[PDB]
Design a protein around this ligand. Structure first.
Ligand code: DHE
Ligand code: DHE
Ligand code: HEC
Ligand code: HEC
Lengths: 521, 521
């Protein structure tokens, strides 16, 4: 084993590092090391740094995300030297991940027969918040009423998102390394009952949400290998694995590695909606019969990204990279209803739904560059003159917002500005009065409200509670600085509570059980 | 360009030979040259023969199938030298074949608007026979009544099979090189109206046979690339191309190159039944909406082969390589009804259906090794005690039969013995009296009946006429020897006609329009 410019090693050293890479590093550094979360670790870059620089970085780690492998004792001094050597060599082809490997990683910590037949705690589960602790590598269960952290669960290092099972009993979390952990909220102390790994890199997970199929199936989509898997919603046992490799929608030529951009459970039929990126296809995977799977392939647009349901939960509004068009998927009739041409490039996400006084039910989406927000009619039944058209456009504080949120019981539309260049703006949120949209938004000083007075204090993601009278926001501040969660009374737009705890390490995503379980947005 | 032991050439010579290989040679020699029709052309084999031996073979060709490229003027002296060099080098990875390449090969010789609005000839089309001329590289249209060759159509060199469109107007032929030719039987002189190439190697083609979809779609499945394509049943315009790459049914691990073993048009729903070999999956491709394709993936058995419909045309009886099990696919309910354990390994084919006096409707299949024939019950509605079970076993003359055939209006079951070691037996056929199956078959001296007195005079494939009172057989005898077609009166089991013509070069497959159009067997 010799690559063109750094440390010759060999085969009982290469394959060892290789194993560790795909199992412990690819989650953030990319399967081919082109990078994702972490920076790219290609040869040219790694060589210039030199063996020593590399070992220091791996052992100690950076406070901006990179774990410390030596200090934590996760890896050995000898192993860290192999990795430093390994990353300087040409990147090999990533391994496949089939049934043997999935079953290998499948572990049931608590058999279904040994789980509580009912809810063994006093927790108000529906108003619980599953807050992601980005750098701490875990999730925090926060009581929506007592406003205190109820339980801290260790997930992994690349904790990405949380999802709920249709019964409201199971908390599902996935990592960017394709590891999934199942949590039973009915135990004395809510805990992990099962886990499994479905690939090398992943971003999606969802449960069966069609009536009658509560807790029947759990699906997860990967970046690598190009595939998605359906597991038993009760034990996480891997049932079927499907490849997303195939022909593109535009050029209709073969594509060797299409990534699963997003997944969403359908309400119209017993099926999962899978967005495949490079091929531009929205797959409808029917799970009425898992032994003999039925899949409908809906051509949309190239480079599919994320999306969300319209108010009725029938039309899936989806964005595409480098495209000002929102592909509308009819999940009932299983077809492409439209390619709505909004102004600029829509920012990938669930979006926000509300009833515009003048236009009826609309679905909105923000624009990263100028902070504007596009509205689209989503009621062809009673408002056909507006259905599937950019009906209007709002204006926020400015650039770089990551989330927008509203609620059926609320009269406000909250929109952040996390990545705005102006520090002041990135520390606040805009609140739109849906009753008077001709008015300018109001600016809520979220960061000023906890109290922290240090760093960037980035403010991210508005999330309501079960009722719809409270709105929570995370107040970032990296590992060793101090973080908090701010709560506002939606009816009064006044501060209501500030959550602090030495355990609230870099809180980001917040998932209210009920609102996640029922797709309320 | 240097391979480890023969003629260094280079790149403007390599790529040229490479192009010619995949376009003109891969049809018979295999995409990786492992061989199929023709012998393998791998380096070790090609090197031992030496440049000179190779050039001689390519230029002159063998009478056992191999075309003469120099003599015919198809290739040049200079080009034949490159190929000789090319085949001695390590085999490269085969090219993909997407939409651009398919449209490139798509040629409409006669626009649909310019075709006759009605039948412009006196031909009795339903009783027409499309006889494959193996070495001559063409098909012969033979009148089922006048007993004379009505038209000879040039198809290509690897003419494999013929199929009919549901209207009975279009004759479809496919080559092992994935080239398809469409023939309009309504013209003054029946002729080609369109052609297209769908891959490098292929064996399957079929038309839409569900009521209402006459001439709507034509599908073709390939060996390489692993894909199938659906084209416009009127112009052969390529509409959709799907990849068969994916996970296996047994080990559920990724397979980079699964071949389409067979295709069959469904009668229960508007869908095509595609058998994928290595992954062991029976795909139900619904064409109600071609823009948004629905596919049901039925797991069967590993290494799927060919099959045929049961009498009702609802259950698809399919064989698998190295398996004594026949997978029964319910095409209505879209599931696997059974894995019938017949004795030995069933020989892949359509099979033969008839009503067994004691067991009711049965589907039969032969066994290459001992010439036995297995029977299986196919009526769970009125004979559930026999449905999906080896109900009985017949005995033929012996080893190596390729076809068995019966007909609803006939009381006989004809079975050949083409590859039997005993020359005498390979020149005859067995006729079973379905009214008395406890009796021994009768031996019809097919070869003795034309008159030829030379070579092996191999006898192959029993095919009835539109009525069901005649049974045709081909009487092989290679290129330069003399061939014929023998016809027997089914009601009398006596000779009825011998067809001879200097144009009947090595006749093999015979497809009666009506029986092919309606899947009568
Ligand atoms: C495609 C995708 C989904 C949909 C999954 C599904 O369907 O189940 C999703 C959803 C999500 C959702 C879903 C809930 C919602 O608020 O709608 C949230 C909050 C979330 C928290 C974050 N993720 Fe996520 N996330 C990515 C990908 C995705 N994020 C990235 O690759 C990206 C852009 C870069 C990265 O690696 O960080 C990214 C950044 C973030 C964040 O910045 C967040 C806010 C903070 C964090 O914890 O990393 N991801
Ligand atoms: C998988 C397959 C099909 C189904 C196609 C479809 O679904 O549309 C089929 C059908 C067929 C059918 C279908 C009709 C029938 O009689 O049922 C026939 C007669 C036929 C004439 C032949 N083919 Fe065929 N054929 C192959 C493959 C196949 N043959 C081979 O690879 C094989 C075993 C070896 C070879 O390359 O020759 C082969 C030999 C033959 C023959 O020996 C025949 C009899 C003479 C010839 O012309 O080559 N093929
Ligand atoms: C995400 C959960 C990570 C995992 C797992 C690993 N790395 Fe990482 N790494 C990550 C980030 C976000 C960064 C950037 C750190 C920053 O604050 O700038 C890094 C950085 C490194 C480097 C970068 C070298 C440089 O460009 O300065 C190296 C060489 C590195 N990481 C190696 C590495 C290895 C070998 C890992 C597995 C054993 C590993 N990382 C895991 C995030 C994450
Ligand atoms: C099928 C329609 C064929 C096509 C097209 C080509 N070849 Fe062929 N080839 C074929 C057969 C059936 C055989 C065996 C001939 C026999 O009677 O034994 C061959 C043989 C050759 C050989 C074989 C050398 C040997 O082992 O003796 C060579 C080198 C060869 N064919 C080359 C070749 C090339 C280069 C072609 C395309 C330009 C080509 N064949 C096409 C059948 C068919």
């Amino acid at each position: 084993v010799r690559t063109n410019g750094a440390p010759d090693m060999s085969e009982s050293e290469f394959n060892e590092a290789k194993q560790i890479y795909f199992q412990r590093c690819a989650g953030c550094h990319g399967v081919l090391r082109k990078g994702a979360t972490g920076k790219p670790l290609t040869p040219d870059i790694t060589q210039q740094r030199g063996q020593q620089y590399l070992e220091a970085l791996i052992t100690y780690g950076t406070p901006l995300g990179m774990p410390n492998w030596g200090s934590s004792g996760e890896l050995s001094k000898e192993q860290i030297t192999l990795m430093a050597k390994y990353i300087q060599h040409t990147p090999p082809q990533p391994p496949e991940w089939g049934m043997p490997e999935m079953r290998e990683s499948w572990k049931v910590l608590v058999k279904p027969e040994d789980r509580p037949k009912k809810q063994l705690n006093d927790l108000d589960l529906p108003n619980l918040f599953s807050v992601t602790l980005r750098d701490a590598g875990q999730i925090a269960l926060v009581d929506g009423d007592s406003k205190k952290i109820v339980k801290v669960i260790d997930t992994g290092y690349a904790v990405h998102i949380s999802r709920m099972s249709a019964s409201g009993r199971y908390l599902l979390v996935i990592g960017r390394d394709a590891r999934i952990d199942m949590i039973d909220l009915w135990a004395k102390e809510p805990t992990k009952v099962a886990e499994i790994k479905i690939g090398i890199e992943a971003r999606s997970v969802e449960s069966s949400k069609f009536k009658g199929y509560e807790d029947r199936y759990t699906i997860a989509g990967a970046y690598w290998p190009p595939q998605f898997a359906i597991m038993d919603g009760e034990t996480l046992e891997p049932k079927q694995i499907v490849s997303t490799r195939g022909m593109t929608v535009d050029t209709q030529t073969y594509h060797p590695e299409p990534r699963v951009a997003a997944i969403i459970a359908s309400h119209e039929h017993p099926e999962f909606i899978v967005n495949v990126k490079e091929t531009g296809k929205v797959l409808l995977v029917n799970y009425k019969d898992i032994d003999n799977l039925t899949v409908t392939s809906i051509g949309a647009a190239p480079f599919l990204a994320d999306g969300g349901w319209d108010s009725s939960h029938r039309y899936f509004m989806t964005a595409a990279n480098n495209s000002n068009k929102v592909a509308v998927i009819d999940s009932k009739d299983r077809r492409l209803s439209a390619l709505v041409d909004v102004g600029k490039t829509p920012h990938p996400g669930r979006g926000a739904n509300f009833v515009h006084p003048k236009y009826g039910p609309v679905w909105s989406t923000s624009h990263l560059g100028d902070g504007s927000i596009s509205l689209i009619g989503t009621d062809p039944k009673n408002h056909p003159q507006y259905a599937w058209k950019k009906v209007a456009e709002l204006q926020g504080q400015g650039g770089g917002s990551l989330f927008i949120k509203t609620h059926p019981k609320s009269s406000h539309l909250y929109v952040d500005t996390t990545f705005n260049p102006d520090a002041r703006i990135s520390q606040s949120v805009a609140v739109f009065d849906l009753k008077n949209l001709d008015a300018k938004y109001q600016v809520l000083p979220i960061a000023e409200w906890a109290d922290l007075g240090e760093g960037a204090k980035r403010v991210v993601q508005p999330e309501y509670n079960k009722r719809g009278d409270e709105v929570w926001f995370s107040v970032w501040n990296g590992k060793n600085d101090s973080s908090a969660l701010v709560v506002v009374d939606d009816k009064t737009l006044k501060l209501k509570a500030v959550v602090k705890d030495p355990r609230l390490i870099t809180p980001t995503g917040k998932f209210n059980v009920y609102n996640t379980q029922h797709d309320v947005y």
